[PDB]
Amino acid sequence: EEAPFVIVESVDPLSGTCMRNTVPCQKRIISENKTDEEPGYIKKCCKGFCIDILKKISKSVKFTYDLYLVTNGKHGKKINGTWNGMIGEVVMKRAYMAVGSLTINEERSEVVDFSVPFIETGISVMVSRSNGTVSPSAFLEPFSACV
Amino acid sequence: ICTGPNDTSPGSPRHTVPQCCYGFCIDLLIKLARTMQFTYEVHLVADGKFGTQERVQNSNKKEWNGMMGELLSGQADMIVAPLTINNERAQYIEFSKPFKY
Amino acid sequence: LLWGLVFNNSVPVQNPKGTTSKIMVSVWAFFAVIFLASYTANLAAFMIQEEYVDQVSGLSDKKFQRPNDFSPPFRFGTVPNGSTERNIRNNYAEMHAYMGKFNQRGVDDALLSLKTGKLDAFIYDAAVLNYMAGRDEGCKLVTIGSGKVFASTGYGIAIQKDSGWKRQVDLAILQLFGDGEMEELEALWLTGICHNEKNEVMSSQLDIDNMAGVFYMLGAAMALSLITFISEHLFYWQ
Amino acid sequence: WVMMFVMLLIVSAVAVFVFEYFTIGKAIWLLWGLVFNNSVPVQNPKGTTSKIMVSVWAFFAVIFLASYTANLAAFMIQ
Amino acid sequence: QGLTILVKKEIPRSTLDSFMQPFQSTLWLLVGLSVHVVAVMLYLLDRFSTLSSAMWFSWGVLLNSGIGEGAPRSFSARILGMVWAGFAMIIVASYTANLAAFLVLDRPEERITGINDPRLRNPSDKFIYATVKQSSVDIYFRRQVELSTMYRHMEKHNYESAAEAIQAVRDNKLHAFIWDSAVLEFEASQKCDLVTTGELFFRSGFGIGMRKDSPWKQQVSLSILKSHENGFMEDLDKTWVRYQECDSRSNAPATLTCENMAGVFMLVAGGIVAGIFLIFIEIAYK
Amino acid sequence: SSVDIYFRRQVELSTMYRHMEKHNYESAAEAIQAVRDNKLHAFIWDSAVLEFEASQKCDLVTTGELFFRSGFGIGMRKDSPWKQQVSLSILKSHENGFMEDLDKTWVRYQECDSRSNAPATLTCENMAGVFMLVAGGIVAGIFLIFIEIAYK
Numbered sequence A: 001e002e003a004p005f006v007i008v009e010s011v012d013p014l015s016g017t018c019m020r021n022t023v024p025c026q027k028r029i030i031s032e033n034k035t036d037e038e039p040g041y042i043k044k045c046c047k048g049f050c051i052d053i054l055k056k057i058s059k060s061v062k063f064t065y066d067l068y069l070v071t072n073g074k075h076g077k078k079i080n081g082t083w084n085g086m087i088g089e090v091v092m093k094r095a096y097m098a099v100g101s102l103t104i105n106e107e108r109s110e111v112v113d114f115s116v117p118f119i120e121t122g123i124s125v126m127v128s129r130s131n132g133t134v135s136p137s138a139f140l141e142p143f144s145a146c147v
Numbered sequence B: 001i002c003t004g005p006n007d008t009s010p011g012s013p014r015h016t017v018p019q020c021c022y023g024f025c026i027d028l029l030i031k032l033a034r035t036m037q038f039t040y041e042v043h044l045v046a047d048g049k050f051g052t053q054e055r056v057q058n059s060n061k062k063e064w065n066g067m068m069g070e071l072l073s074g075q076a077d078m079i080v081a082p083l084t085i086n087n088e089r090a091q092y093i094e095f096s097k098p099f100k101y
Numbered sequence C: 001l002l003w004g005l006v007f008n009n010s011v012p013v014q015n016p017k018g019t020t021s022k023i024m025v026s027v028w029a030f031f032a033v034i035f036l037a038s039y040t041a042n043l044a045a046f047m048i049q050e051e052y053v054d055q056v057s058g059l060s061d062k063k064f065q066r067p068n069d070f071s072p073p074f075r076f077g078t079v080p081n082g083s084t085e086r087n088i089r090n091n092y093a094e095m096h097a098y099m100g101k102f103n104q105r106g107v108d109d110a111l112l113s114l115k116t117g118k119l120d121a122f123i124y125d126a127a128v129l130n131y132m133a134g135r136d137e138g139c140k141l142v143t144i145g146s147g148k149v150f151a152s153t154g155y156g157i158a159i160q161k162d163s164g165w166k167r168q169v170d171l172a173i174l175q176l177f178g179d180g181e182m183e184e185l186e187a188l189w190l191t192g193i194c195h196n197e198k199n200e201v202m203s204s205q206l207d208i209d210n211m212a213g214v215f216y217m218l219g220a221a222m223a224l225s226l227i228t229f230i231s232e233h234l235f236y237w238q
Numbered sequence D: 001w002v003m004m005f006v007m008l009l010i011v012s013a014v015a016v017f018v019f020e021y022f023t024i025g026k027a028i029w030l031l032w033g034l035v036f037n038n039s040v041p042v043q044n045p046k047g048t049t050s051k052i053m054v055s056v057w058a059f060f061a062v063i064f065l066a067s068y069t070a071n072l073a074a075f076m077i078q
Numbered sequence E: 001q002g003l004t005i006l007v008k009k010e011i012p013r014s015t016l017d018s019f020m021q022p023f024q025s026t027l028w029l030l031v032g033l034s035v036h037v038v039a040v041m042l043y044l045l046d047r048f049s050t051l052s053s054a055m056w057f058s059w060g061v062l063l064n065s066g067i068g069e070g071a072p073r074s075f076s077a078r079i080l081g082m083v084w085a086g087f088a089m090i091i092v093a094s095y096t097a098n099l100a101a102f103l104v105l106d107r108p109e110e111r112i113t114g115i116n117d118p119r120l121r122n123p124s125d126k127f128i129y130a131t132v133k134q135s136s137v138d139i140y141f142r143r144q145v146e147l148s149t150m151y152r153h154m155e156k157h158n159y160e161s162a163a164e165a166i167q168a169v170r171d172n173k174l175h176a177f178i179w180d181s182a183v184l185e186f187e188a189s190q191k192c193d194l195v196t197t198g199e200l201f202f203r204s205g206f207g208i209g210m211r212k213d214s215p216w217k218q219q220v221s222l223s224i225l226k227s228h229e230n231g232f233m234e235d236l237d238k239t240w241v242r243y244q245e246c247d248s249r250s251n252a253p254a255t256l257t258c259e260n261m262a263g264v265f266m267l268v269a270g271g272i273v274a275g276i277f278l279i280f281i282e283i284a285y286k
Numbered sequence F: 001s002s003v004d005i006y007f008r009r010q011v012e013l014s015t016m017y018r019h020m021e022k023h024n025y026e027s028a029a030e031a032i033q034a035v036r037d038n039k040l041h042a043f044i045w046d047s048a049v050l051e052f053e054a055s056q057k058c059d060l061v062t063t064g065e066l067f068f069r070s071g072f073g074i075g076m077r078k079d080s081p082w083k084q085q086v087s088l089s090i091l092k093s094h095e096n097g098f099m100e101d102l103d104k105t106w107v108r109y110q111e112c113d114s115r116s117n118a119p120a121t122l123t124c125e126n127m128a129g130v131f132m133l134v135a136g137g138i139v140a141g142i143f144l145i146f147i148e149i150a151y152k
């Protein structure tokens, strides 16, 4: 949904349908289950970083694809000892691959398999820069003891 | 212990003498070995270089150099060293996941 | 006489005389001029030098394992209920109980405390930060160098178990690396404004200590004076 | 420069205020000197308050040149 | 010709608060404390074996004006005065050192370097682009969607005609105003408030228009190739584009001004006020 | 190397691929001794074999910008069975901080720092030009009086 690698953007008919470096994507939204109508909905076009790596994998390994956003059984995790999520929806063959925000731990990799990673990530820190470094021993620093 | 004819670099013949090979990677090899029941005896590179592909035999064939050449030939059996990940070696050998990013 | 003129001046004092000494004091005046004129320029460089950010090791460091050695300052923050806090609680149990009163609501509340000192360090994942690097105009927000950080893993691609495709997505992505394309994508999607030089910026309004570094010399001179008075008084006591 | 000369002339003249206890042609010759990091022989003022005034102007003296020589590290760096 | 980014330049003036800038407003206090310490302590510590003969002395050596009298007669006061002067020099040395490490290392923000850097690859909503609506440069833009981050901002700020969209840069209403080359490199060459960054990216070429396969194709397409080797166009260049009125704008680093130096004049006024209000007291004591 | 093959399979730096064609060494076990001798005035290699050279020596520093974002790894032959148990054993060593213990066990780092140096350490042999003047005055001063007697 909302990584900084795959951004969703709703369409404007400027060209009748999302174009110009994007690829279409779908997500069947519905509620009020008693409606008993045809269930599903429409969705938008998907671009970004992982979208970009996707296109270059595609037109160089020669397949055709189609994206569908995930709605329920949220982003991969553990529940009741079963496997919902962005791994379950690859173990239940409702899809075939998952691209985007994942990791390689010892649990999300017993069910599905993994590629060779294309960034690095891990637990890091974040600090400030320490504005100001007046050297307190300057007033005898310039001239060496030779003079 | 760690074997090797490495008493001399390329440019002079080799005399077979064991040595010591300690440091960082041996601890990872062992932390895995107890995890998968190894019993090893580590070898060293006879080419003194990593190894890649080039035109050999004054002809139009190929032959992988260095330690990867020692490996694919079958003499070796596993690569622990800071070995890089690049497409040109990916096609003939099986990498693990990366460990030291 | 031959001190006040190498420095600013004494009070006007007598004994310029001797109709050939009338050039020695002049030569020393000239040498003073050149000397002071070299000093109060060359020192006008030692107030210009690069910035300075702390030299933190990996968190296997005494500045964090015992964040009460230097007891007051440090206070590490995070956002719990996720897949990074559980990573803390398999080797560093105590520091989570050390978090306490700094559980910032969400990830984007940390960049509101690093602008007021309320947080000192901040533990989190890597890539979201490196992207959040080039995101604040004020360039007082950074990361630390790579090759050190804790949860060294990555983002891969999820291929169905025992599919036939996990043999042929490698030779695409690793080609994309090993033929000069990916870092282009990164410069198109990740790199930010402030990944540039930390060039020489001025100093500040001089505080006490940096200038106090010579008040101690003034003190040592005061002590020399006192010792000299106490000593020379003995000749009159004899 | 103009207002420096103005306050110079004014404070040199109003040094005459010590009359209520040397000529103008003596005071100017003093104060205009020190500003230029002078060393001319001079006849000193007479009057403690005169000492105080001269101290004030000497403070102005040590500030002026110490600023000037600071700026000429810019028009010499072209 | 080509396309280049117009940018309005600013008239430089560096900011100093007052003459006492580089000293934190606490340091003068302990400097005065130390002067009184060594002065009075010298007076007594020579009176054992001339009060003003220490007061004025060490209140004048700092201000470098050998006023009044005083001297170290004992072997005591000599060494103390002799190092007091060294301190009084080191202060006025480092003060100039630190003002020179300021009035040189503060230039305005770096000028824009064209469409190369990320500084423009995300328009922060402070400073703004523009071009003329339905131009040719927007036609170049839209068919390159990557700059939709830019293109979007320009979707709301474009102007009706180039004259207005450049006149509105001379009033700080709009920083940049992108266009081609041969209407910029003339425009700055009259007045002294506009300047390019020169970098070229669209090596186009102007031309004349006429409908397809008119009876006038070959004749014009020939009679232009004549007028570029018998000088006619060169004479036109010289005659109609009267080029030079401006110059290099050689980065004059902030000659000071009155209101940037008011501090010292409040000093001399505080001195003058001491005059008639110290001619009462120390003569009423007389 | 692992970097040559990055260079000879890409043409936009053919100039460089040539420029190195008649210089390259035998192995990085000699160039870090070389740069301390000013023979080859530059060097390009991996990270974890250079960013450790700021803790054993301190004469030779890095620059601070990355080049090519690959990683290392363990090699095994074509699809032997260990290929999966190994992958599931590595990550067993990225939560118990095993890598974080080796980080302190075999990079004894922080023995120096970048520490942007001090400009213009001025000294004697380029300030002597005035001591010669004052020495000439001093020695001429014992010579002048051997003349001004004549004025008397």
Ligand SMILES: N[C@@H](Cc1cc(-c2ccc(Cl)cc2Cl)cc(CP(=O)(O)O)c1O)C(=O)O
Residues within 6 Å of the ligand: A002, A003, A004, A101, A102, A103, C081, C082, C083, C084, C085, C125, C128
């Ligand atoms: N790859 C990870 C997914 C994962 C993703 C994110 C994340 C959050 C916001 C943004 Cl904008 C971007 C990202 Cl990538 C954060 C965490 C950790 P947390 O939310 O606890 O801080 C996380 O685990 C996994 O599979 O566990």
